């Protein structure tokens, strides 16, 4: 029962969250977790192997992936799972790639049976391991998520909390009202039922895709997403109202628990900064002006980099309408003013710098913070690495909520630790997001094969012809013709084909924020609020 994991440089982080994440599964816990690394253990991490619980469930060994001897040493053939991982923080982005993909070969070579899981930084290199079971592609998803953050707010936090397992352990703390409800719906998760019948499957065999998600909210509060035909094993998002269900067809759905167990311009502008251009941003821009998107509401976008745009970028981006070049980092008031940050709306920054660990995320925290104070009417987004530092973001001399959050997060991390990082103000605002937070996706994938593919289709990225786009709709005074969320759901999908998932809320102390995923459909709605719906009409 030996599980394999390989990495170039371990750190408390990657390990920890893996571990804490990995044994979160009741089903598969007992395994020997195998660690392969060239360099010695640090004085910190080597301390977490000595703890009474993780001692004999974690095997650590010194060695590489290339030599055949040390592969033997791990008992690969016997081993039930093989994981390769990439270091995040490094001097060279382009080299790390080589390291990984290489490892992939050697492992595949050695034992071409076992599943194979791996991370890849640059999109360009995706092409090389297409042969592997499952592959998580960093940049494409990074830029994608953050990109969709410019249509609806807090795109990020939504997805993250989806892919994180919890019991609703965190909703019972009863400090307040919102948070009570906020955390409650955290444990919320996506699940797999297809086969036979169960509490939810039979209800409608013969009616459409739509009528299913209606009366699923009535009995249980489950809301399905998409049906894989048994034919091509292609996944669909929100099949149109024309599609039908069978007795054997795939149901993907969300619930809190598994079914079995219970030059001047016009519109708002957006400004992006990054270290270097790459095949990365080509995909940043895809979702912005797509097909489904209108030519009225487009958001012309300005690119601000440190280094001059490279040649390929030019041939790559000249297709689209509406973008330009401006240069300089985010330091100078002036470098930002030339662009019209004032006229503009949302701020996008993705940066980094090549001793202590969490620290290396500093260079950005700072540049940003200033902006919080320069423009109180302004909204911004950000990317760190270490999912510890989050709350260190937008902080005020005196806040009762913002400071009193500390005690609440500790009070979670001490009972049991999965998500310590939810409650924090800016995080739930979507103003914050991080890299290794989606990394969880990979670990969890081992138990769920529909977990990765589902994601891309949500964003942008992969479209097999039947599919749908994730869109949002503000709530206003004529929608208040509707009382609540359930009364909404049933008058919503009786006109067009759209399914809701979560919601969004705001109160005062500018102002605060929320995301509630699949709330019981009894819950009310204010004036300023937002909901995440899926709309498919590319194809009739």
What residue numbers does the annotated binding site cover?
A: 161, 164, 186, 188, 263-265, 273, 304, 306, 328, 351
Indicate if 429 and 491 belong to the same structural domain.
Answer: no
201 by Cβ neighbours in 10 Å (0-12 / 13-18 / 19+) ranks as: buried
Give me the count of residues in the chain: 540
Indicate if 17 and 112 belong to the same structural domain.
Answer: yes
Q: Where do we find the tokens 């791990």?
A: 74
Name the 3-class secondary structure at 254: strand
DSSP string of 416-428, one letter each residue: --S-SSSS-HHHH
| Angle, helix 155-162 to helix 138-148, in steps of 10 degrees | 130
Q: Where do we find the tokens 């990765």?
A: 452
Lookup: tokens for 415:
């009972």
How far apart, in whole angstroms, are the C-alpha atoms of residue 390 and residue 68? 41
C-alpha closest to that of 397 among 365, 373, 366, 424: 373
Lookup: tokens for 201:
């499957």
List the end-to-end C-alpha distance of the chain, in Å, as a whole number.
49
**What is the Cβ-side half-sphere exposure of residue 205, based on CA atoms within 13 angstroms?**
8
C-alpha closest to that of 38 among 72, 13, 4, 10: 10
How far apart, in whole angstroms, are the C-alpha atoms of residue 4 and residue 7? 10
Cα 495 to the center of its chain, rounded Å: 30
Name the 3-class secondary structure at 155: helix
Structure resolution, Å: 4.2
C-alpha closest to that of 202 among 194, 190, 210: 194
Query: CA dihedral defined by 116, 117, 119, 120, rounded to 10 degrees?
Result: 30
| Angle, helix 155-162 to helix 436-445, in steps of 10 degrees | 30
Contact status, residue 452 vs residue 117, Cβ threshold 8 Å = no
Cα 395 to the center of its chain, rounded Å: 24
Indicate if 509 and 431 belong to the same structural domain.
Answer: no
E strand or H helix at 471: strand 469-474
> Apex CA 390: angle with CA 400 and CA 284, to 5°?
130
Contact status, residue 115 vs residue 81, Cβ threshold 8 Å = yes
Lookup: tokens for 540:
């009739």
Give Cβ neighbours of residue 421 (< 8 Å, ≥ 6 apart).
Answer: 387, 388, 390, 391, 409, 427
Contact status, residue 513 vs residue 505, Cβ threshold 8 Å = yes
Q: Report the 10 Å Cβ neighbour count for 163.
A: 22
Cα 146 to the center of its chain, rounded Å: 10
Lookup: tokens for 162:
């989806």
C-alpha closest to that of 434 among 163, 149, 154, 142: 142
Indicate if 20 and 105 belong to the same structural domain.
Answer: yes
Contact status, residue 7 vs residue 65, Cβ threshold 8 Å = no
How far apart, in whole angstroms, are the C-alpha atoms of residue 23 and residue 353? 33
C-alpha closest to that of 351 among 120, 93, 161, 85: 93
Indicate if 267 and 250 belong to the same structural domain.
Answer: no
Contact status, residue 306 vs residue 276, Cβ threshold 8 Å = yes
CATH number at residue 74: 3.40.50.720
Q: Is residue 324 part of a domain?
A: yes
Buried b (16+ CB within 10 A) or exposed e, 123-141: bbbbebbeebebbbbbbbb
Structural domain that includes position 39: 2-132
How far apart, in whole angstroms, are the C-alpha atoms of residue 19 and residue 49? 11
Indicate if 321 and 211 belong to the same structural domain.
Answer: no
SS (H, E, C) 349-396: EECCCCCCCHHHHHHHHHHHHHHHHHCCCCEEEEEECCCCHHHHCCCC
Indicate if 303 and 412 belong to the same structural domain.
Answer: yes
What residue numbers does the annotated binding site for Na(+) cover?
A: 161, 164, 186, 188, 265
Q: Where do we find the tokens 């206003």?
A: 476
Q: Is residue 224 part of a domain?
A: yes
Indicate if 513 and 393 belong to the same structural domain.
Answer: no
C-alpha closest to that of 327 among 315, 316, 339: 339
Domain count of the chain?
3
How far apart, in whole angstroms, are the C-alpha atoms of residue 303 and residue 443? 34
Q: Report the 10 Å Cβ neighbour count for 331.
A: 11
How far apart, in whole angstroms, are the C-alpha atoms of residue 241 and residue 451? 24
How far apart, in whole angstroms, are the C-alpha atoms of residue 82 and residue 4? 5
Contact status, residue 111 vs residue 77, Cβ threshold 8 Å = yes
Q: Is residue 166 part of a domain?
A: no
Contact status, residue 217 vs residue 164, Cβ threshold 8 Å = no
Q: What experimental approach yielded this model?
A: cryo-EM
Indicate if 298 and 359 belong to the same structural domain.
Answer: yes
C-alpha closest to that of 31 among 67, 62, 70, 58: 58
Name the 3-class secondary structure at 273: strand
| Number of separate helices (H) and strands (E) present in the chain | 17, 20
How far apart, in whole angstroms, are the C-alpha atoms of residue 216 and residue 223? 6
> Apex CA 386: angle with CA 383 and CA 391, to 5°?
75
Lookup: tokens for 509:
């102390």
How far apart, in whole angstroms, are the C-alpha atoms of residue 314 and residue 274? 16
Indicate if 234 and 359 belong to the same structural domain.
Answer: no
E strand or H helix at 413: helix 400-413
* Residue spans of alpha helices (H) in 56-190: 68-73, 93-110, 138-148, 155-162, 178-184
> Apex CA 105: angle with CA 102 and CA 110, to 5°?
130
441 by Cβ neighbours in 10 Å (0-12 / 13-18 / 19+) ranks as: buried
Q: Is residue 184 part of a domain?
A: no
Q: Is residue 139 part of a domain?
A: no
What residue numbers does the annotated binding site for K(+) cover?
A: 263-264, 273, 304, 306, 328, 351
Sheet holding 223-224, edge to edge: 189-193, 251-255, 223-224
Q: Is residue 348 part of a domain?
A: yes
Contact status, residue 361 vs residue 389, Cβ threshold 8 Å = yes
Lookup: tokens for 344:
């503009």
E strand or H helix at 116: none
Give Cβ neighbours of residue 386 (< 8 Å, ≥ 6 apart).
Answer: 13, 357, 358, 361, 434, 436
Q: Could you tell me if residue 136 is left (phi over 0), alpha (psi between -120 and 50 degrees) or otherwise beta?
A: beta
Gaps in the chain (C–N > 2.5 Å) come after which residues? 262, 354, 509
C-alpha closest to that of 409 among 395, 399, 401, 419: 419
Contact status, residue 245 vs residue 230, Cβ threshold 8 Å = no
C-alpha closest to that of 37 among 17, 7, 66, 68: 7
- In degrees rounded to 5, what are phi and psi of residue 73? -50, -25
Lookup: tokens for 431:
């103003």
Which residues are 119's β-sheet partners? 136
How far apart, in whole angstroms, are the C-alpha atoms of residue 498 and residue 489? 9
Contact status, residue 436 vs residue 89, Cβ threshold 8 Å = no
Q: Is residue 170 part of a domain?
A: no
Indicate if 477 and 518 belong to the same structural domain.
Answer: yes
DSSP letter at 481 equals G
Q: Is residue 176 part of a domain?
A: no
159 by Cβ neighbours in 10 Å (0-12 / 13-18 / 19+) ranks as: buried
C-alpha closest to that of 35 among 57, 68, 66: 57
104 by Cβ neighbours in 10 Å (0-12 / 13-18 / 19+) ranks as: buried
Indicate if 94 and 224 belong to the same structural domain.
Answer: no
Contact status, residue 311 vs residue 276, Cβ threshold 8 Å = no
How far apart, in whole angstroms, are the C-alpha atoms of residue 276 and residue 281? 10
């Amino acid at each position: 029962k030996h599980v394999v994991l390989c990495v170039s440089s371990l750190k408390i982080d990657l390990l920890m969250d893996f571990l804490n994440e990995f044994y979160a599964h009741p089903r598969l816990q007992d395994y020997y977790v195998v660690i392969l690394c060239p360099t010695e253990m640090d004085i910190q991490v080597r301390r977490v192997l000595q703890i009474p619980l993780w001692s004999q469930r974690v095997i650590y060994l010194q060695g590489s992936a290339l030599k055949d001897q040390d592969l033997m040493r791990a008992k690969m053939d016997n081993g039930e799972a093989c994981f390769i991982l990439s270091s995040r923080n490094e001097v060279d982005r382009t080299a790390a790639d080589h390291q990984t993909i290489l490892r992939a070969w050697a492992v595949k070579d050695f034992a071409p049976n076992c599943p194979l899981y791996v991370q890849i930084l640059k999109p360009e290199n995706k092409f090389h391991v297409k042969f592997a079971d499952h592959v998580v592609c960093e940049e494409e998803c990074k830029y994608a998520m953050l990109a969709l953050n410019c249509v609806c707010p807090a795109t990020s936090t939504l997805i993250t909390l989806l892919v994180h397992t919890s019991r609703g352990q965190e909703g019972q703390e009863s400090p307040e009202q919102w948070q009570r409800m906020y955390g409650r719906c955290s444990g919320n998760e996506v699940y797999h039922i297809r086969m036979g019948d169960s509490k939810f499957f039979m209800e409608y065999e013969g009616k459409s895709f739509t009528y299913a998600a209606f009366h699923a909210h009535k009995k249980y509060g489950v809301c399905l997403i998409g049906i894989r035909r048994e034919e091509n094993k292609s996944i669909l998002l929100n099949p149109g109202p024309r599609h039908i269900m069978a007795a054997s067809d795939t149901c993907f759905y969300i619930n809190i628990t598994k079914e079995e167990n219970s030059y001047g311009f016009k519109n708002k502008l957006i400004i992006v900064s990054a270290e270097t251009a790459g095949n990365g941003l080509y995909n940043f821009i895809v979702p912005l002006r797509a097909y489904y998107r209108s030519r009225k509401e487009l958001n012309p976008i300005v690119l601000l980099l440190d280094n001059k745009p490279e040649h390929h970028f030019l041939e790559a981006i000249c297709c689209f309408p509406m973008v330009y070049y401006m240069e300089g980092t985010i330091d100078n008031l002036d470098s930002l003013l030339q662009c019209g940050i004032i006229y503009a709306d949302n701020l996008v920054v993705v940066d980094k710098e090549s001793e202590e660990d969490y620290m290396a995320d500093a260079k950005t925290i700072v540049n940003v913070q200033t902006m919080f104070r320069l423009f109180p009417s302004l909204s911004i987004i950000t990317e760190l690495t270490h999912p510890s530092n989050m709350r260190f973001m937008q902080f005020r001399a005196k806040d009762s909520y913002s400071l009193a959050l500390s005690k609440l997060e500790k009070k979670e991390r001490e009972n049991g630790s999965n998500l310590a990082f939810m409650f924090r103000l800016p995080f739930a605002a979507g103003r914050v997001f991080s890299i290794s937070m989606l990394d969880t996706l990979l670990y969890q994938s081992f138990v769920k094969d529909y977990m990765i593919t589902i994601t891309r289709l949500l964003l942008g990225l992969d479209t097999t012809p039947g599919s749908g786009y994730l869109c949002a709709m503000k709530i206003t005074e004529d929608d208040l013709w509707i009382r609540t969320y359930g009364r909404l759901f049933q008058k919503l999908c009786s006109s067009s084909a759209e399914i809701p998932i979560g919601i969004y809320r705001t109160e005062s102390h500018n102002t605060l924020s929320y995301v509630l995923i699949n709330p019981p459909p009894d819950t009310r709605l204010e004036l300023n609020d937002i909901v995440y719906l899926i709309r498919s009409d590319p194809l009739a």
